[PDB]
Swiss-Prot record:
Main location: secreted
EC code: 3.2.1.17
Gene3D superfamilies for the chain: 1.10.530.10
Keywords noted in UniProt: Amyloid, Amyloidosis, Antimicrobial, Bacteriolytic enzyme, Disease variant, Disulfide bond, Glycosidase, Hydrolase, Secreted, Signal
Domain called C-type lysozyme: residue spans: 1-130
Protein's UniProt name: Lysozyme C
Disulphide linkage map: 6-128, 30-116, 65-81, 77-95
Miscellaneous field: Lysozyme C is capable of both hydrolysis and transglycosylation; it also shows a slight esterase activity. It acts rapidly on both peptide-substituted and unsubstituted peptidoglycan, and slowly on chitin oligosaccharides.
Gene: LYZ
Lineage, opening ranks: Eukaryota, Metazoa, Chordata, Craniata, Vertebrata
Catalyzed reactions: Hydrolysis of (1->4)-beta-linkages between N-acetylmuramic acid and N-acetyl-D-glucosamine residues in a peptidoglycan and between N-acetyl-D-glucosamine residues in chitodextrins
Cellular compartment(s): Secreted
Length: 130
């Protein structure tokens, strides 16, 4: 499913993402935007290392979910990567919360550093009523 901006904002808010581990809703919106464009079925295989990024948050199959074909994969979220491809993002959000519970936090995603860090990310939640 490809979420409309405000629809996603309200959904994430309801799932307890706003201010989770100090991460504001607008940063999460900036992350999903640049990682997948609010698309839940987005997948990206990295031929150089054999791991694939799944879903709206492009969560990695090496550390977070298990797809069975990634070498030395730890399944920290204890989920099948398939779960991060559903239209219902409840599992993707619970896994994303797991990821940021690590010391790096939201910095775990390079795209966040490139396009969200130190920027005016207000635009991502404007007019959504969250």
């Amino acid at each position: 499913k490809v979420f409309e901006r405000c629809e996603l904002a309200r959904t994430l808010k309801r799932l307890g993402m706003d201010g989770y581990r100090g991460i504001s809703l607008a940063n999460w919106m900036c992350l999903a935007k640049w990682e997948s464009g609010y698309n839940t079925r987005a997948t990206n295989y990295n031929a150089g290392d054999r791991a694939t990024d799944y879903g709206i948050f492009q969560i990695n199959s090496r550390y977070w979910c298990n797809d069975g074909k990634t070498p030395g994969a730890v399944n920290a979220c204890h989920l099948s990567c398939s779960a991060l491809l559903q239209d219902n993002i409840a599992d993707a959000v619970a896994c994303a919360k797991r990821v940021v519970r690590d010391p790096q936090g939201i910095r775990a995603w390079v795209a966040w550093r490139n396009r969200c860090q130190n920027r005016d990310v207000r635009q991502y939640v404007q007019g959504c009523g969250v």
